Protein backbone atom coordinates (compact mmCIF):
# COMPACT_ATOMS: atom_id res chain seq x y z
CA UNK A 1 0.00 0.00 0.00
CA UNK A 2 2.95 2.31 0.57
CA UNK A 3 3.96 1.29 -2.94
CA UNK A 4 0.48 2.25 -4.12
CA UNK A 5 0.51 -0.70 -6.49
CA UNK A 6 -3.04 -1.81 -6.15
CA UNK A 7 -4.72 0.69 -3.81
CA UNK A 8 -6.52 -0.15 -0.62
CA UNK A 9 -6.28 0.42 3.11
CA UNK A 10 -5.40 -1.96 5.93
CA UNK A 11 -7.96 -1.82 8.73
CA UNK A 12 -6.96 -2.91 12.24
CA UNK A 13 -9.93 -1.36 14.04
CA UNK A 14 -11.95 -4.37 12.92
CA UNK A 15 -9.41 -6.50 11.08
CA UNK A 16 -10.61 -6.24 7.53
CA UNK A 17 -8.94 -5.32 4.28
CA UNK A 18 -10.54 -2.75 2.00
CA UNK A 19 -9.49 -3.01 -1.63
CA UNK A 20 -10.30 -0.19 -4.00
CA UNK A 21 -10.19 0.62 -7.66
CA UNK A 22 -11.69 4.02 -7.20
CA UNK A 23 -10.91 7.25 -9.07
CA UNK A 24 -8.49 9.42 -7.09
CA UNK A 25 -7.20 12.87 -7.82
CA UNK A 26 -8.28 15.20 -10.56
CA UNK A 27 -6.02 16.11 -13.51
CA UNK A 28 -7.72 19.39 -14.40
CA UNK A 29 -7.61 20.42 -10.78
CA UNK A 30 -3.97 19.32 -10.47
CA UNK A 31 -2.85 21.65 -13.25
CA UNK A 32 -4.45 24.60 -11.45
CA UNK A 33 -1.77 24.19 -8.83
CA UNK A 34 0.96 25.10 -11.33
CA UNK A 35 -1.02 27.99 -12.77
CA UNK A 36 -1.24 29.78 -9.44
CA UNK A 37 2.48 29.09 -9.17
CA UNK A 38 3.13 30.68 -12.55
CA UNK A 39 1.12 33.80 -11.74
CA UNK A 40 3.08 34.12 -8.53
CA UNK A 41 6.29 33.93 -10.55
CA UNK A 42 5.35 36.75 -12.92
CA UNK A 43 4.55 39.25 -10.18
CA UNK A 44 7.95 39.07 -8.51
CA UNK A 45 9.47 40.47 -11.68
CA UNK A 46 6.58 42.86 -12.21
CA UNK A 47 7.36 44.37 -8.83
CA UNK A 48 11.03 44.83 -9.70
CA UNK A 49 9.76 46.97 -12.58
CA UNK A 50 7.44 48.86 -10.18
CA UNK A 51 10.22 49.89 -7.77
CA UNK A 52 11.54 52.10 -10.55
CA UNK A 53 8.42 54.21 -10.07
CA UNK A 54 7.94 54.62 -6.34
Amino acid sequence: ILDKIFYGVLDQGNGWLYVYETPNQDATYDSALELVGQLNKVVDQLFEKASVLY
Partner: protein, 143 residues
Protein backbone atom coordinates in the same frame (compact mmCIF):
# COMPACT_ATOMS: atom_id res chain seq x y z
CA UNK B 1 -36.76 -25.57 -24.01
CA UNK B 2 -33.29 -26.59 -22.80
CA UNK B 3 -31.53 -23.80 -24.69
CA UNK B 4 -34.23 -21.22 -23.95
CA UNK B 5 -33.23 -21.13 -20.27
CA UNK B 6 -29.80 -19.76 -21.10
CA UNK B 7 -30.37 -17.47 -24.06
CA UNK B 8 -32.47 -15.18 -21.87
CA UNK B 9 -31.89 -13.87 -18.36
CA UNK B 10 -34.60 -15.49 -16.27
CA UNK B 11 -35.14 -16.51 -12.66
CA UNK B 12 -34.09 -20.13 -12.36
CA UNK B 13 -32.57 -22.37 -9.72
CA UNK B 14 -30.84 -25.69 -10.19
CA UNK B 15 -33.61 -27.98 -8.79
CA UNK B 16 -36.28 -26.78 -11.21
CA UNK B 17 -33.96 -27.77 -14.03
CA UNK B 18 -32.73 -30.91 -12.27
CA UNK B 19 -36.23 -32.31 -11.94
CA UNK B 20 -37.16 -31.86 -15.59
CA UNK B 21 -34.15 -33.28 -17.46
CA UNK B 22 -33.16 -36.24 -15.26
CA UNK B 23 -35.71 -38.84 -16.46
CA UNK B 24 -35.41 -37.55 -20.01
CA UNK B 25 -31.73 -37.18 -20.80
CA UNK B 26 -30.22 -39.93 -18.65
CA UNK B 27 -31.72 -42.15 -21.33
CA UNK B 28 -29.75 -40.22 -23.93
CA UNK B 29 -25.96 -40.34 -24.21
CA UNK B 30 -23.24 -37.64 -23.98
CA UNK B 31 -23.22 -35.25 -20.97
CA UNK B 32 -25.48 -37.47 -18.90
CA UNK B 33 -25.70 -40.96 -17.44
CA UNK B 34 -22.70 -43.01 -16.44
CA UNK B 35 -20.37 -42.66 -13.47
CA UNK B 36 -18.02 -40.21 -15.16
CA UNK B 37 -20.72 -38.21 -16.91
CA UNK B 38 -22.46 -37.53 -13.63
CA UNK B 39 -19.33 -35.57 -12.81
CA UNK B 40 -20.54 -33.63 -15.86
CA UNK B 41 -23.98 -33.36 -14.28
CA UNK B 42 -21.92 -31.90 -11.42
CA UNK B 43 -20.47 -29.46 -13.89
CA UNK B 44 -23.90 -28.44 -15.14
CA UNK B 45 -25.10 -27.46 -11.68
CA UNK B 46 -22.09 -25.17 -11.42
CA UNK B 47 -23.06 -23.51 -14.68
CA UNK B 48 -26.68 -23.06 -13.64
CA UNK B 49 -25.47 -21.53 -10.36
CA UNK B 50 -23.16 -19.33 -12.42
CA UNK B 51 -25.99 -18.37 -14.72
CA UNK B 52 -28.12 -17.21 -11.83
CA UNK B 53 -25.21 -14.98 -10.88
CA UNK B 54 -25.03 -13.48 -14.37
CA UNK B 55 -28.74 -12.61 -14.25
CA UNK B 56 -28.46 -11.12 -10.78
CA UNK B 57 -25.45 -9.06 -11.78
CA UNK B 58 -27.44 -7.43 -14.60
CA UNK B 59 -30.61 -6.64 -12.65
CA UNK B 60 -29.50 -6.27 -9.05
CA UNK B 61 -26.84 -3.62 -8.52
CA UNK B 62 -26.70 -4.52 -4.83
CA UNK B 63 -28.29 -7.55 -3.21
CA UNK B 64 -27.70 -8.96 0.24
CA UNK B 65 -25.22 -11.81 0.52
CA UNK B 66 -27.75 -13.50 2.82
CA UNK B 67 -30.69 -13.32 0.39
CA UNK B 68 -28.44 -14.52 -2.37
CA UNK B 69 -27.82 -17.74 -0.50
CA UNK B 70 -31.55 -18.46 -0.71
CA UNK B 71 -31.60 -18.02 -4.48
CA UNK B 72 -28.63 -20.27 -5.30
CA UNK B 73 -29.61 -22.84 -2.61
CA UNK B 74 -26.10 -22.77 -1.15
CA UNK B 75 -24.43 -21.84 2.10
CA UNK B 76 -22.61 -18.55 2.52
CA UNK B 77 -19.23 -20.24 2.02
CA UNK B 78 -20.18 -21.78 -1.31
CA UNK B 79 -21.99 -18.72 -2.63
CA UNK B 80 -18.75 -16.74 -2.35
CA UNK B 81 -16.53 -19.20 -4.22
CA UNK B 82 -18.81 -18.94 -7.25
CA UNK B 83 -18.80 -15.14 -7.28
CA UNK B 84 -15.01 -15.33 -7.50
CA UNK B 85 -14.96 -17.66 -10.51
CA UNK B 86 -17.30 -15.36 -12.43
CA UNK B 87 -15.10 -12.33 -11.71
CA UNK B 88 -12.11 -14.45 -12.66
CA UNK B 89 -13.52 -15.09 -16.11
CA UNK B 90 -13.92 -11.36 -16.57
CA UNK B 91 -17.63 -11.19 -17.41
CA UNK B 92 -18.73 -8.90 -14.62
CA UNK B 93 -17.04 -7.22 -11.71
CA UNK B 94 -18.24 -7.45 -8.13
CA UNK B 95 -17.01 -7.02 -4.57
CA UNK B 96 -18.13 -9.31 -1.76
CA UNK B 97 -18.12 -8.31 1.87
CA UNK B 98 -17.17 -11.14 4.19
CA UNK B 99 -19.32 -10.15 7.24
CA UNK B 100 -22.56 -10.32 5.23
CA UNK B 101 -24.40 -7.16 4.54
CA UNK B 102 -23.84 -6.69 0.81
CA UNK B 103 -22.43 -8.16 -2.30
CA UNK B 104 -22.36 -5.55 -5.07
CA UNK B 105 -22.41 -6.54 -8.73
CA UNK B 106 -21.11 -3.66 -10.83
CA UNK B 107 -17.82 -2.04 -11.54
CA UNK B 108 -18.24 1.39 -9.88
CA UNK B 109 -18.38 4.17 -12.45
CA UNK B 110 -15.78 6.79 -13.22
CA UNK B 111 -16.90 10.33 -12.37
CA UNK B 112 -17.04 11.29 -16.07
CA UNK B 113 -19.33 8.34 -16.90
CA UNK B 114 -21.93 9.45 -14.35
CA UNK B 115 -22.04 12.93 -15.78
CA UNK B 116 -22.34 11.70 -19.34
CA UNK B 117 -25.58 9.88 -18.58
CA UNK B 118 -27.23 12.84 -16.91
CA UNK B 119 -26.48 15.09 -19.87
CA UNK B 120 -27.96 12.60 -22.32
CA UNK B 121 -31.18 12.34 -20.35
CA UNK B 122 -31.81 16.06 -20.53
CA UNK B 123 -31.13 16.27 -24.28
CA UNK B 124 -33.74 13.63 -25.03
CA UNK B 125 -36.48 15.55 -23.24
CA UNK B 126 -35.83 18.59 -25.40
CA UNK B 127 -36.08 16.56 -28.59
CA UNK B 128 -39.48 15.10 -27.77
CA UNK B 129 -41.14 18.33 -26.69
CA UNK B 130 -39.80 20.06 -29.79
CA UNK B 131 -41.46 17.55 -32.11
CA UNK B 132 -44.66 17.42 -30.05
CA UNK B 133 -44.98 21.18 -30.31
CA UNK B 134 -45.15 21.07 -34.09
CA UNK B 135 -47.72 18.26 -33.94
CA UNK B 136 -50.27 20.08 -31.75
CA UNK B 137 -50.99 22.46 -34.64
CA UNK B 138 -51.75 19.51 -36.91
CA UNK B 139 -54.26 18.10 -34.44
CA UNK B 140 -56.42 21.24 -34.44
CA UNK B 141 -56.69 21.00 -38.21
CA UNK B 142 -57.41 17.28 -38.38
CA UNK B 143 -60.11 17.32 -35.69
Amino acid sequence: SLVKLFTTNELMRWPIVQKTYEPVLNEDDLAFGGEANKHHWEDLQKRVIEHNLRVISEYYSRITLLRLNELLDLTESQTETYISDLVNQGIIYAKVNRPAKIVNFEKPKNSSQLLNEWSHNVDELLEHIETIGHLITKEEIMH
